Write a protein that binds this ligand. Structure first.
Ligand SMILES: *[C@@H]1O[C@H](CO)[C@@H](O)[C@H](O)[C@H]1NC(C)=O
Ligand SMILES: *[C@@H]1O[C@H](CO)[C@@H](O)[C@H](O)[C@H]1NC(C)=O
Ligand SMILES: *[C@@H]1O[C@H](CO)[C@@H](O)[C@H](O)[C@H]1NC(C)=O
Ligand SMILES: *[C@@H]1O[C@H](CO)[C@@H](O)[C@H](O)[C@H]1NC(C)=O
Ligand SMILES: *[C@@H]1O[C@H](CO)[C@@H](O)[C@H](O)[C@H]1NC(C)=O
Ligand SMILES: *[C@@H]1O[C@H](CO)[C@@H](O)[C@H](O)[C@H]1NC(C)=O
Lengths: 198, 596
């Protein structure tokens, strides 16, 4: 999805194996805020929110708590008290074409900053001046959603990067997204410490 | 709400929709340059037309925001850059006439072929047919024939065209609130609104004269030595008391004196520092040359080249089947795409050129963080100067020994340093009076100091007074002698070389002082010094955001251009030339004593 209309997928009622993601070498950024990757495979959470979008290379830094930019203020805003992981990888192979891939759009102007975990898909003309815009794109009135240009020959700071942000929350409801518990081989006829289903 | 917020949003809208269009135009231009095909020419023309129309519409929208209600320096600078009318303020008929005049001058200069009367079956073009004759011949009448014939044809064709050109450019400049076209060119160095760092358009001419007055003794001694050597080469033509003949300076126009190194060598018997054979023996490819240049830039602390640079650049000649422009050019295509187009050979000149162009690439990379309309040098001099300092540092014997191209037991005595410094003087110092005289003459023509009927009588008088070069035969007003040069005929500023030359040695002194070099300035290498690279990168990162005076304060600690680093660079040579000129007479006479 585009960063203005980032897809949110709720992951529930399954076992989340986080070691598959962490041990992959295909990801440039695997920055976890509020939790460490080593203990993710053990902890259990009520739901997992997977927010997916495409941004530029230079804009990956703005997907963090406390940051400032076009993406943070007008496209995707993260709370300061955020627990989760931001995973980003280069997508020059898929999201760039020789003519230019303009299918990805970003919100360039908004009257106020976005709230955390807010999606704005409005297509109303931005009013930058006192004059009434009146629906027409003229002087001091601009379209808020601007297309992105993706070429395979661009620099590393302008190449498309796919970002998936996983948000971990705990609610009063029983936590169902748990990490894989594992298992050793069973040994019989000896005095051992057994842990069977807790 | 406020005017400042409106301008900031408009500038963001401009930079966003202008970076992609500039990238498309630049990519089409690159595809044309590496692949000269008719469809590529059409694509380049279409992209250029789209870019120009978009810039016209954005400028038209930009003018609606008054400058006086904006207090932010960067926003005001971008709005000032965008709001320039250019030729748009002029009427459509006159604008079309000016464009037609520029195009026809380009065709006349580019496709000008001149050969000897009575043998017209084939003729030689300027490049490389006449360049080789000017640079290598030792015959007086052949060089005189080539010089006079080319100025006869080109000047007689271009004189009415130049007369129309000056009037149209002055009309456009006065319509744009400037005194003349010279003021329009001098407006590049204008700084307004900064406390203490302000620079005026009128101050530039005074500073150029003040520096040139100190340039003049060194140039007089160099001219006397070159005059004595040319007198040795040509026994009767050159006079001891007069100026040098115009057609004997080694180039078509007198722009550089670098082709007289063979004739004017101090110590011919002693060797040079040529490293071509060493690279040929060790099979150094062009890729190795660029890797060594990259190693030099990482040595001083600057960032290394991108992956896109190595993948997308053309560093070897493609072949007979595919045609490309051979001129080395660094391309900042936009969106972080930096490339070098050079047909690199295994020569010292290509190696120094590779360092110069990679310096251009480093300068382009440094200001990538800045807004799109401020992604340029602070002035026209700095952009070339940052490449020229790399060219200076790479050519030193210490660098060649460090990188393995020179033998570690090579003896660096005073004679090699003297002859190398004389060659550098012929290339660098020699262009300064010609540049200053040409720019001053053009400024007086635009200002109206010189009437149209007295253009050439003053011009030769200037050339005798400043350059110390006399005309072979008198020229009347049917000739247009200045317009035979590439820069003036195609509407290009010429003071960039003078500013680049002074800034080059100012930067060299600043970096060498940063690197704690304790010897002569010409023997200094800026490799392995992190602090020098950091001091350079502080200015490099600014781009066009800050005034050039503040940038010069950042590097050298001075608020104005200075002439002392150049004189310090050539001080051993200056003392040697003063010692060698005891018998001869320093200085020249403006009279017709040698020949007229
Ligand atoms: C150059 O142009 C020719 C003709 O259009 C084309 O066949 C060739 O692939 C091009 N080469 C490059 C390197 O672009
Ligand atoms: C001027 O605008 C730039 C935006 O490009 C901003 O970063 C900077 O802080 C502004 N400067 C002042 C003094 O307001
Ligand atoms: C550009 O031209 C327009 C109309 O000719 C004029 O109103 C405006 O002031 C000009 N701007 C500059 C900077 O010359
Ligand atoms: C450029 O430098 C970085 C960091 O020093 C390094 O990771 C990278 O491999 C270098 N690039 C090349 C092409 O060697
Ligand atoms: C070079 O140094 C030697 C040794 O002092 C001296 O004899 C010679 O004259 C010097 N040559 C020049 C050109 O300074
Ligand atoms: C600069 O650094 C490189 C690598 O560290 C080294 O090989 C080179 O010799 C150094 N330069 C000098 C002049 O010692």
């Amino acid at each position: 999805a585009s960063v203005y209309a980032w897809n949110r997928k709720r992951i529930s009622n399954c076992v989340a194996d986080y070691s598959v993601l962490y041990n992959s070498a295909s990801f440039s950024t695997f920055k976890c805020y509020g939790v460490s990757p080593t203990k993710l495979n053990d902890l259990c959470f009520t739901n997992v929110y997977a927010d997916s979008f495409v941004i530029r290379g230079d804009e990956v830094r703005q997907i963090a708590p406390g940051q400032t930019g076009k993406i943070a203020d007008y496209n995707y805003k993260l709370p300061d008290d955020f627990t989760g992981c931001v995973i980003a990888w280069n997508s020059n192979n898929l999201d760039s074409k020789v003519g230019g891939n303009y299918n990805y759009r970003y919100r360039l102007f908004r009257k106020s900053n976005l709230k955390p975990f807010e999606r704005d898909i409005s297509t109303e003309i931005y009013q930058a001046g006192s004059t009434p815009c009146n629906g027409v794109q003229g002087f001091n009135c601009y379209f808020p959603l601007q297309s992105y240009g993706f070429q395979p020959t661009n620099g590393v700071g302008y190449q498309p990067y796919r970002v998936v942000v996983l948000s971990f929350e705990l609610l009063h409801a029983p936590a169902t997204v748990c990490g894989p518990k594992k298992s050793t081989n069973l040994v019989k006829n000896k005095c051992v410490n057994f842990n069977f289903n807790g | 709400s406020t005017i400042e917020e409106q301008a900031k949003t408009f500038l963001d809208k401009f930079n966003h929709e202008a970076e992609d269009l500039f990238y498309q135009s630049s990519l089409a231009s690159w595809n044309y340059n590496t692949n000269i095909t008719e469809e590529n020419v059409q694509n380049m023309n279409n992209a250029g037309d789209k870019w120009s129309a978009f810039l016209k519409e954005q400028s038209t929208l930009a003018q609606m925001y008054p400058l006086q209600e904006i207090q932010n320096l960067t926003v005001k600078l971008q709005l000032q850059a965008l709001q320039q009318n250019g030729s748009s303020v002029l009427s459509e008929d006159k604008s079309k006439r000016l464009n037609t005049i520029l195009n026809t001058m380009s065709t006349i200069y580019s496709t000008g072929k001149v050969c000897n009367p009575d043998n017209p079956q084939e003729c030689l073009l300027l490049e490389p047919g006449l360049n080789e004759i000017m640079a290598n011949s030792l015959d007086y009448n052949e060089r005189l024939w080539a010089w006079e014939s080319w100025r006869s044809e080109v000047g007689k064709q271009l004189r009415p065209l130049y007369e129309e050109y000056v009037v149209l450019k002055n009309e456009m400049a006065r319509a744009n609130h400037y005194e003349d076209y010279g003021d329009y060119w001098r407006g590049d160095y204008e700084v307004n609104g900064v406390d203490g760092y302000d620079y005026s358009r009128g101050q530039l001419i005074e500073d150029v004269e003040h520096t040139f007055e100190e340039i003049k003794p060194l140039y007089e001694h160099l001219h006397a030595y070159v005059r004595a050597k040319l007198m040795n080469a040509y026994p009767s033509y050159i006079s001891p008391i007069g100026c040098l003949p115009a057609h004997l300076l080694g180039d078509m126009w007198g722009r550089f004196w670098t082709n007289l190194y063979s004739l004017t060598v101090p110590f011919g018997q002693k060797p040079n520092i040529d490293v071509t054979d060493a690279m040929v023996d060790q099979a150094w490819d062009a890729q190795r040359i660029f890797k060594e240049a990259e190693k030099f830039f990482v040595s001083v602390g600057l960032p290394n080249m991108t992956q896109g640079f190595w993948e997308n650049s053309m560093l070897t000649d493609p072949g007979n089947v595919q045609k490309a422009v051979c001129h080395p050019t660094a391309w900042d295509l936009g969106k972080g795409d930096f490339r070098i187009l050079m047909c690199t050979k295994v020569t010292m000149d290509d190696f120094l050129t590779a360092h110069h162009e990679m310096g251009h690439i480093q300068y382009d990379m440094a200001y990538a963080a800045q807004p799109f309309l401020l992604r340029n040098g602070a002035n026209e001099g700095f952009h070339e100067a940052v490449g020229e300092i790399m060219s200076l540092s790479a050519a030193t014997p210490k660098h060649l020994k460090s990188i393995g191209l020179l033998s570690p037991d090579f003896q660096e005595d005073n004679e090699t340093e003297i002859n190398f410094l004389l060659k550098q003087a012929l290339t660098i110092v020699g262009t300064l009076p010609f540049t200053y005289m040409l720019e001053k003459w053009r400024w007086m023509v635009f200002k109206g100091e010189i009437p149209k009927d007295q253009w050439m009588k003053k011009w030769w008088e200037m050339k005798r007074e400043i350059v110390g070069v006399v005309e072979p035969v008198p020229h009347d007003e049917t000739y247009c002698d200045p317009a035979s040069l590439f820069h003036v005929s195609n509407d290009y500023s010429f003071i960039r070389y003078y500013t680049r030359t002074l800034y080059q040695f100012q930067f060299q002194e600043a970096l060498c002082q940063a690197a704690k070099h304790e010897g002569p300035l010409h023997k200094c290498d800026i490799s392995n010094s992190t602090e020098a690279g950091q001091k350079l990168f502080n200015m490099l990162r600014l781009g066009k955001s800050e005034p050039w005076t503040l940038a010069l304060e950042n590097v050298v600690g001075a608020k104005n251009m200075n002439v002392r680093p150049l004189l310090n660079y050539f001080e051993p040579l200056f003392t040697w030339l003063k010692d060698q000129n005891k018998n001869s007479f320093v200085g020249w006479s403006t009279d017709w004593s040698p020949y007229a």
